Amino acid sequence: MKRTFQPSVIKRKRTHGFRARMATKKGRQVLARRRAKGRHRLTV
Amino acid sequence: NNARLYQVLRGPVFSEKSQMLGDSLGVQVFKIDSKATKLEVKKAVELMFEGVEVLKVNTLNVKGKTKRFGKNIGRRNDYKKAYVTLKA
Amino acid sequence: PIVKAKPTSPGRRFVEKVVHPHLYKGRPFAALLESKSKTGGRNNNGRITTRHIGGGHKQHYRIIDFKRTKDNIPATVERIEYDPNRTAHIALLKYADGERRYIIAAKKQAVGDTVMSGEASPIRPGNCLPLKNIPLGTVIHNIELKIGKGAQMARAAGASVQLLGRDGIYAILRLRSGETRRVHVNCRAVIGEVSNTENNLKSLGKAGASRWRGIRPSVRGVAMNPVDHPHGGGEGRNKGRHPTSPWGQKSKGLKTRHNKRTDSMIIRRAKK
RNA sequence: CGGAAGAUCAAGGGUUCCAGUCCAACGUUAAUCGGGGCUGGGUGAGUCGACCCCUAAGGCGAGGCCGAAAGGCGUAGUCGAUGGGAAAUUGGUUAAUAUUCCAAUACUUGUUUAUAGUGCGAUGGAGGGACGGAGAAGGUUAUGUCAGCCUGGCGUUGGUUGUCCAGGUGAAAGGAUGUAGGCUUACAGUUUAGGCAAAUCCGGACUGUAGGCUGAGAUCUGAUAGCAAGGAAGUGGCAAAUACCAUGCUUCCAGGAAAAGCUUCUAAGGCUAUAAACGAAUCGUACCCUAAACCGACACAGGUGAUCAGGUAGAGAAUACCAAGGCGCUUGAGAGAACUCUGCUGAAGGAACUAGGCAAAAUGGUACCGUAACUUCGGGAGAAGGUACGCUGUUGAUGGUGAUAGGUCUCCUUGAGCUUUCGACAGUCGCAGAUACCAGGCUGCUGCAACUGUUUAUUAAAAACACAGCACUCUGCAAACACGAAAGUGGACGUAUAGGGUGUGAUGCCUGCCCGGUGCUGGAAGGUUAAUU
Helix, strand or coil: CCCCCCCCHHHHHHHHCHHHHHCCHHHHHHHHHHHHHCCCCCCC | CHHHHCCCEEEECCCHHHHHHHHHCCEEEEEECCCCCHHHHHHHHHHHCCCCCEEEEEEEEECCCCCEECCEECCCCCEEEEEEEECC | CEEECCCCCCCCCCCEEECCCCCCCCCCCHHHEECCCCCCCECCCCCECCCCECCCCCCCEECECCCCCCCCCCEEEEEEECCCCCCCCEEEEEECCCCEEEEECECCCCCCCEECECCCCCCCCCCEEEHHHCCCCCEEECEECCCCCCEEECCCCCCCEEEEEECCCEEEEECCCCEEEEEECCCEEEECCECCCCHHHCECCCHHHHHHCCECCCCCHHHCCCCCCCCCCCCCCCCCCCCECCCCCECCCCCCCCCCCCHHHEEEECCC
């Protein structure tokens, strides 16, 4: 049957990407948290 | 400038497609700089192989293959190659 | 007038359509047109603030000249058109200088006759006059409330207002709501009753016809659960409470009028 | 298998593509094989797509508004495709790319130079772009089929040099042309309460004078292309799309994007023809894509948008069998117990089964005849129920196309060949002719809900919800009401024939009594009554 993921690159980069994170104060806190944990993947 | 055309051509391509094209249509296949345009390839070839005139440049980017080694997953460089047709 | 559909289908058995053979069959005057996209009854917060709004046909906005300030330049009625944005018909006006406008078509307004705006204008359907140059007792529509703002009251299909009298700088009007009100005598009104008087005589016939107009279905409060509506709950059918809105506001007589600044402009209301 | 299990994409993936090599692990078995390991290779564009120009919803938003802070909103603008905007087709070629390479023949749009003429210029004005549902009659082509022609064949078994058999064989875009259709008065002059200024442009008002635009297709050219056995053919009939004419036409109401490119006009302050030479960057292009490569933990019976659409039957994109093409679904070998699953047949009986005809069996097509209660006059209804149906010969009528003649993409008459649709008569075979696949079971009484619809994704599809219709009530516009802290919004660029809330729920006949209680509405004489003082 139809499953939950249903990928789309435009939608992925527009809802989770680097610019979408950087465009809000809370997304920048997401990025700061990821950098402090040391993740090799910042954003989708 | 002239110090940019020296770095445009990175090396000839030695393969069966290359050899067939050189034998049949007299076209040269080069590995070129990843940021090089068709006009710079024209100028570079005509500059560095004196006495030849370029007819057409066809270029393409080819992605590098993901080749593992030991416990790692690496990948080869991307690169750009040009097909250069010459006035015979 | 009204025409009944033959009961060829159960969805056609109760269709009573308003039919006007004299309305323009062509397209509206494109210069007086604007794009207009649906809201779904959602505001700038994206929340539904007006329920039961959704879908329907695409429609352009026709720019209606509610103000009528091209005074003392006669206009001829080029055509009478259907307007998807309102219940009334709209008359395309062609002024002596060639400028075209849309106005609300009066009931007794046809193609070819000339309308006038200003103070020295005949008392004929379609003419726009300040309320002080309008004799008492004539039927008017498109009433201004502020001077120069444009017509606000009596604009729907079949609308009419009775000009009862004058008590100084105010004109006394009887509205279709049964409310006697005063309006500044320098405000304007248009002579005649608004066209399409058999609007409320029509019958949609089926649910799809209501959907075509952008009206989504309406779920009764007693058909819900108590977490949704004050009327929700109950084993079987039950009301249990005084009627209220989904926000707890009584719906059976409770008056909801706050405006203390406009209170002195209202003479009285009718009790039936 | 073949409206795919074939082919082209998009999305998504990312090398899975091709070759060589290897078989440990992976592959539900083995594997010499592989979408596995390893090593090489492979994606070529002015015309395809993106980028680019333009904008929709919706974002962000100099200033501005609002808000303890954080922030929220919003104007000018600036982004944002799923939409608008320039242009190529046939053939060949690789192991793997091809509208990209090669060949042939095209097209679009620029820069520079030169020759002439010469008022050019916009983010602004006006045009244009530019648009809905349904339906119908045509004209076509793609395509098919037969023929013609070319090349081979004389058949393991009666016959097969013929009215025989098989295979092959039809070049596009473009340029001319201007057809079937569709639309449609044209010009000149004067003047101007308009198009925010201006206008020679549009709009308006006056006066005389009397085929054009678009357009499928066919035709000509393109065109001595390419294509097999080793050097061949290559043009006629008929049928025919859901594609094209057609963004047409006709109708209807629920009344049908925007902006730019483009054509014109001017405002503040180069352009038009002729060519000649020279350009058209960058990014994608492999491969899967009804899937073993995407989403489902798997090489998972699920899901995944669009495009193409051969033959014989057939109404058909159903169905059956085939073509092109692609596959045999990654354990096999036996045996032929019980029992389980999936099917087929069944004496006599025929619902006795069971909670219940659940399941099964049965019906099933076309034409014609015939068809009850009741009804809102539409229906019910395909009610019910009957008859015919294959093939062969003869024969009547008839639609289309139209060679040949008689009187220039033309018209009129005759009409060969091909083809369509209805009959009649006579015969003939079988148990059976709608012979397979395919393909309504029907009826009587009664409860409920008017009906089409919607719903508990994953045990409930209903009598539940919705519904058109009805009523009550609120709401005079900065409306009531809703979101929000507010600014700002929706309601609505609506205006009481409107909008909100509530109940009820087509329609027919209708809807009695009670205002004590609790609400709601009106009133204020009296009693009580806050901060405050």
